[PDB]
Amino acid sequence: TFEPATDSPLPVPGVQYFLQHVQSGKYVHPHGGSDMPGNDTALVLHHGFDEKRDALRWVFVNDAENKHQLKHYSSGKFVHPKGGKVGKEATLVVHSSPGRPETMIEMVQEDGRTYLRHTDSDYYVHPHGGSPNPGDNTRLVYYSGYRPSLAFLAIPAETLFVDRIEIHQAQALESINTITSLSDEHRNDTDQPVQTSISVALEESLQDSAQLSFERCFGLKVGSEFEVGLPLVGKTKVSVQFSGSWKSSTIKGEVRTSAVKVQINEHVTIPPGKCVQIRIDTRRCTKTAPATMYLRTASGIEVQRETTVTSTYHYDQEVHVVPV
Ligand SMILES: OC[C@H]1O[C@H](O[C@@H]2[C@H](O)[C@@H](O)[C@H](O[C@H]3[C@H](O)[C@@H](O)[C@@H](O)O[C@@H]3CO)O[C@@H]2CO)[C@H](O)[C@@H](O)[C@H]1O
Ligand SMILES: OC[C@H]1O[C@H](O[C@@H]2[C@H](O)[C@@H](O)[C@H](O[C@H]3[C@H](O)[C@@H](O)[C@@H](O)O[C@@H]3CO)O[C@@H]2CO)[C@H](O)[C@@H](O)[C@H]1O
């Protein structure tokens, strides 16, 4: 189950988020709720939420023009300290002016929780008055220091595409095993060699699996199913379809193809008066690999998320006729 106390993800720049004060469950709004808030309009906490409400969307910006800043999505205004310098009890406001070093703001992780902090300072974002459960329209201010009641959750507010997942080949660990299976015995009780068909079913013992796992939670919305190629054995690509939620720290995959058979039917020449069986050796690669996810916004912005790919894949298989 999802717990923000351990699982709140760090937001990726360029992506739309809602911002929620964890302990009150309130969202960060421009005071008054406008899609076009006025310059020096205060950021406040308010219970009000609808997924369709663009006035509640925020985007972290980190580039040459705006290094460590925070943008109101619907207006394009930046989050500034009222008056233009961070200090004690400076109200967070929107303003249609570029960010500066003295306005920098980002989400940070401190002791296992996520906070808003003015970069290169000990000033963090507090509800004015410092209530752990502030009421609607409580303004957000900079103030020195943090504590758990101040934590925020950046909830993803748009749906991204998964373009590819590239494993870090130097950190990939592979453990190989052989799964060995035997058919029913077949006897040729005649005095002449005989063509016979020996069949065996192995669905249960050759089951493939795969998953992505995350330190906090995945933290991004990509829809109910996505498919990518992953190197489940050496560099060999196998398509895996994943179904999960932004809140999951483990996203289960379904391995979509197999290089091996789970129903075997072998044409055997059985010598006179001999008994034989088929032996099936199937190789299994259990793999763990740190990887980088390559994602993309509808607007064409390319973002990255680190993960770990864990998998079990049956990849080569051999069939031998053996005496009983
Ligand atoms: O407050 C954040 C803002 O501080 C500095 O801007 C100056 C004032 O502090 C700010 O109050 C003032 O706001 C103007 C806005 O420019 C006008 O369109 C109009 O909407 O009235 C308000 C007054 O409420 O603007 C001045 C500078 O023009 C920083 O320069 C700015 O970047 C932010 O950090
Ligand atoms: O507002 C965030 C702040 O709330 C609590 O602090 C109290 C007041 O809310 C805060 O305004 C007040 O600030 C003092 C400041 O300590 C003094 O140095 C001087 O500037 O006066 C202001 C009042 O304008 O401080 C009190 C607590 O003394 C929380 O305790 C604090 O941690 C923040 O979350």
Residue numbers in the entry: 4 to 327
Article passage:
The complex of SaroL-1 with the Gb3 trisaccharide presents the same packing as the one with GalNAc. The protein structure is also similar in both complexes albeit with a variation in the fold of the aerolysin β-sheets that present a small kink in its medium region, resulting in an angular deviation of ~17°. The terminal α-galactose of the trisaccharide occupies the exact location and establishes the same contact as GalNAc in the other complex. Electron density was observed in binding sites β and γ only. Site α is not occupied, presumably because of close proximity with the neighboring monomer in the crystal. This packing effect also explains the small kink observed in the aerolysin β-sheet. The second galactose residue (βGal) is perpendicular to His98 in site β and Tyr146 in site γ with hydrogen bonds involving ring oxygen O5 of galactose. In both cases, an acidic amino acid (Asp43 in site β and Glu92 in site γ) bridges between the two Gal residues by establishing two strong hydrogen bonds between O6 of αGal and O2 of βGal. Finally, the reducing Glc also participates in the hydrogen bond network through hydroxyl O2 interacting with Asn42 (site β) or Lys91 (site γ). The location of the terminal αGal is similar in CGL and SaroL-1, while the other part of the trisaccharide shows a significant variation as demonstrated in the superimposition of SaroL-1 and CGL complexes.
